[PDB]
């Protein structure tokens, strides 16, 4: 199978280039996509996956296994991270040198238990310490109400220098329908943007979900605060049977965001994981998002600080 | 074009299932356990509910 292109809007989008017909870097940097598995031996994900792990059976921790039945994880990965595959007629990530710890913490529909995610988020955050590896979190996943199990384990892990990016939530148009773990506020909490322009930029899709308006427009996070903006509507990406798919979601913008932020990393291996996110909200700035419900100049409740891009 | 639901918290889920269908008769409606953490995929053929012990609907359903 080969992807309807190598570099799907968002991939084209990001790299604020509409000729690439590959991408390039995030080599040093690991990406833990905590999901519902990743189909590893994907072409354009083979040799990426240096841990797969699974929190999901009766055993706690079943090391080797991370199995994607669903398809989900297998996509978030691939826009992550995909590499175009031995041959070079795949599909392409954000950060194709990246390597990915594969670790599932949803079930089979794409659901699954607090107490398996947050357990996840502690192993990342132990397995970075010990082995001194640089690690982006990557959470396509959350509930509308904060979970303050996986806020500590949220905590625990951006204290030992792990990034963390996770998806806004999709209960918008309406204000303050931001979702948790994203709206924590030492999460990067990702809004979907959509291939439309909206007052001269990018438009934030209508069911992204918003921030509190009330906490907007000082560029400082808070609990609730979208951080910033990126392709999450039409992606394409791998697929857990071994092609591709498109989907929708602040899933697939949050993985755009991951892999932006591996990319950087790579780049600059001198980063701690807050100047890499202070970066990350820097460059957001570069491309004010003013299209969609809500949003507009400035910092705003819909799209946050911005779109952060590779230029 | 409905996109929320926010009258069916608290109702019965055969209650909300009728509501919702009546809008949006080819709705895939999903009914999990309140608390269940799910995947951030806006699939717009969808409707969750979730729901507490007794089968009441804990928050505002909406498409997705
Ligand atoms: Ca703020
Ligand atoms: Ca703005
Ligand atoms: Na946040």
Redesign the pocket.
């Known amino acids: 199978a080969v992807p309807s292109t190598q570099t799907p809007w968002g991939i084209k989008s990001i790299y604020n280039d509409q000729s690439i017909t590959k991408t390039t870097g995030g080599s040093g940097i690991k990406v833990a996509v905590l999901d519902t598995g990743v189909y590893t031996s994907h072409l354009d994900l083979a040799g990426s996956a240096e841990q797969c792990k699974d929190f999901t059976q009766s055993n706690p921790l079943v090391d080797g296994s991370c199995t994607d039945r669903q398809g989900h994880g297998t996509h978030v990965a691939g826009t992550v991270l995909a590499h175009g595959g031995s041959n070079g007629q795949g599909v392409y990530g954000v950060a194709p040198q990246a390597k990915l710890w594969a670790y599932k913490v949803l079930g089979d529909n794409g659901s699954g238990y607090s107490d398996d995610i947050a357990a996840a988020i502690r192993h990342v955050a132990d397995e970075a310490s010990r082995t001194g590896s640089k690690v982006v979190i990557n959470m396509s996943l959350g509930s509308s109400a904060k979970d303050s199990l996986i806020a500590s384990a949220v905590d625990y892990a951006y204290g030992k220098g792990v990034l963390i990016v996770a998806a806004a939530g999709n209960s918008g148009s309406g204000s303050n329908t931001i979702g948790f773990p994203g709206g924590l506020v030492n999460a990067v909490a990702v809004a979907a943007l959509e291939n439309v322009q909206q007052n001269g930029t990018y438009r934030v899709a209508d069911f992204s979900s918003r921030?509190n308006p009330a906490?907007?427009?000082?560029?400082?996070?808070?609990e609730r605060?979208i951080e910033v903006s990126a392709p999450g509507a039409s992606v394409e990406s791998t697929w857990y049977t071994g092609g591709y798919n498109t989907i929708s979601g602040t899933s697939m913008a949050t993985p755009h965001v991951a892999g932006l932020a591996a990319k950087i990393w790579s780049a600059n291996t001198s980063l701690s994981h807050s100047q890499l996110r202070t970066e990350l909200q820097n460059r957001a700035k570069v491309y004010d998002i003013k299209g969609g419900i809500g949003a507009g100049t400035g910092?705003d409740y819909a799209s946050g600080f911005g779109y952060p891009r590779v230029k | 074009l409905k996109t929320e639901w926010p009258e069916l918290v608290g109702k019965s889920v055969e209650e909300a299932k009728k509501v919702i269908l009546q809008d949006k008769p080819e709705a895939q409606i999903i009914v999990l356990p309140v608390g269940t953490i799910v995947t951030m995929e806006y699939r717009i053929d969808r409707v969750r509910l979730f729901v507490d012990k007794l089968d009441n609907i804990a928050q505002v359903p909406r498409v997705g």
């Open positions: 921030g906490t907007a427009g000082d560029y400082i996070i808070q605060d910092d």
